[PDB]
Amino acid sequence: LVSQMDPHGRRTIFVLTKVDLAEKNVASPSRIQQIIEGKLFPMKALGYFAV
Amino acid sequence: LVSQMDPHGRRTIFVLTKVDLAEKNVASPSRIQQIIEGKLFPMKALGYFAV
Ligand SMILES: [K+]
């Protein structure tokens, strides 16, 4: 939806919701490190990725 | 995909993972009960089981 709006992230900030559910499920912080870096988020959202 | 390859509910069985999150209300309990009953499938399904 967003990568077709602004693929450079200039018009968007990436947020996360329910990251505690990662701890309730087997936690993979290595996937979180990619999350903060936006490797798996095509829109390349700008700003700090709040949770 | 299964709604097109198995619209008749002859092969496809849906299984719900993270059943413990229905207890915590992390995932909507109402939509969990409906998927157990099968009201939320746009197709026929072979069955449903809890993971
Ligand atoms: K929900």
DSSP A1-51: --TTT-TTSTT--------HHHHHSPP-HHHHHHHHHTTT-TT---S----
Distance from C-alpha of B22 to C-alpha of B28, rounded to nearest angstrom = 7
Distance from C-alpha of A44 to C-alpha of B29, rounded to nearest angstrom = 34
Chain A, nearest residue to B19 by Cα: A25
Chain A, nearest residue to B18 by Cα: A25
The burial class, CB within 10 Å (0-12 / 13-18 / 19+), for A43 is buried
In 3D space, the residue among B38, B34, B42 whose CA is nearest the CA of residue B1 turns out to be B42
Q: In angstroms, what is the resolution?
A: 5.5
Q: Both tokens of residue A23? A: 């701890």
Q: Both tokens of residue B13? A: 């069985």
H or E segment and range at residue B47: strand B47-50
Count other C-beta atoms under 10 Å from residue A21's C-beta.
14
Substitution target in A20, A25, A26 with the highest count of B β-carbons within 10 Å is: A25
